[PDB]
Design a protein around this nucleic acid. Structure first.
Ligand SMILES: [Zn+2]
Length: 205
RNA sequence: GCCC
RNA sequence: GGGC
């Protein structure tokens, strides 16, 4: 190619991001989960139960055909709802993760591919490797409490089942390991205007 | 339906 | 079996 662009984000936004990420404790238990393929992710979440802090954002898919298919069987995201997303956020957030961080997931193959494709092979991964029943014991309880935190899974998902959300997954997997869900308010690490296009034009031109 |  |  003749295209040579290092970042998707401006330096200003990269600096805001770096500051925001200081809310992450480099040594606290940290869950990570994605929806979409590791080579073409559409939803990313990281969650630290110790503080209630979470990182949550979206990305428009490159493979629209595979996406519409994945939506039917897993995430139920409509692609039009992913238009206002910030390009480059996935790379920027992953680049900003502390060196040699320990990340917990269920399971690890997709997480590993994504992080390694970003040159983070320094990140250590713990796979909880739970069954399909044990990992989703608190599925209803989590959605009951935290549904307002993600409005993106509007499509009917079949195998009809509850849609898979990267954020709800992190919270419910933690609940499974902790043997309970304790009721508490969570805190978004990223500013809203970093995650979505937020401008409202006065007039169309 | 697709991936491991 | 696990995952989208
Ligand atoms: Zn979600």
């Amino acid at each position: 190619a003749m295209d040579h662009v290092e970042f998707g984000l401006t330096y200003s936004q990269l600096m805001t991001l770096k500051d925001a990420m200081l809310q992450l404790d480099p040594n606290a238990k940290t869950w990570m989960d994605i929806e979409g393929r590791p080579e073409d992710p559409v939803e990313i979440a990281l969650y630290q139960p110790s503080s209630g802090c979470y990182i949550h954002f979206f990305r428009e898919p490159t493979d629209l055909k595979q996406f519409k298919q994945d939506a039917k069987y897993s995430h139920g995201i409509d692609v039009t709802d992913l238009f206002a997303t910030q390009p480059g956020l996935t790379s920027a957030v992953i680049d900003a993760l502390p060196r040699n961080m320990v990340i917990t997931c269920q399971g690890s193959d997709d997480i590993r591919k994504l992080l390694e494709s970003q040159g983070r092979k320094d990140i250590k991964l713990i796979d909880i490797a739970l069954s399909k029943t044990d990992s989703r014991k608190y599925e209803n309880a989590v959605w009951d409490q935290y549904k307002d935190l993600c409005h993106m899974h509007t499509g009917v998902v079949v195998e009809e089942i509850t849609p898979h959300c990267a954020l709800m997954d992190c919270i419910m997997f933690d609940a499974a390991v902790s043997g309970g869900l304790n009721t508490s308010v969570l805190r978004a690490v990223l500013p809203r205007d970093m995650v979505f296009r937020t401008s409202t034009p006065r007039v169309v031109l």
